[PDB]
Design a protein around this ligand. Structure first.
Ligand SMILES: [La+3]
Lengths: 60, 60
C-alpha cells in the first residue's frame, strides 16, 4: 500500500538522519523530507514515495 | 505545455463560473478549483489539469 510505504519510508529516513550531526544534515534532505510530508498530507502517497527517493539520494 | 494549459484552464473555468449566481456555485467546484491552484503553485501542472477536469465535471 502506498500510504503504508509512505509513512514507513518517512520513518526510516528520519531514523537514518537522527544519527547525523544536526549541523551536517543537508538542506536538500530537509526539503525533500518536507515535500514527502506535504504530499502525504494531501493524500498523494505515490508522490511522497518519489520525494523519499530524493531524500535518500541526499543522505551523506 | 502543461504550465500554459493549467493557467489557461483555470482562467476558462473562472470565466464560466463568473456567469453563475454566487450562491449557486457548488462547493465541490470551488474545492476542485482550489486543488488545481494548489497543484499549480507546487509546480505540478499535470495534476492541476486533472483537478480542472473535476471542476468542469462539477459545473451545472
Ligand atoms: La501535490
Amino acid at each position: 500500500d502506498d500510504k503504508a510505504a509512505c509513512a514507513d519510508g518517512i520513518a526510516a529516513v528520519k531514523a537514518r538522519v537522527e544519527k547525523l550531526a544536526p549541523e551536517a544534515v543537508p538542506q536538500k534532505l530537509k526539503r525533500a523530507l518536507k515535500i514527502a510530508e506535504r504530499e502525504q498530507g494531501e493524500g498523494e502517497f505515490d508522490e511522497c514515495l518519489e520525494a523519499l527517493d530524493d531524500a535518500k539520494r541526499a543522505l551523506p
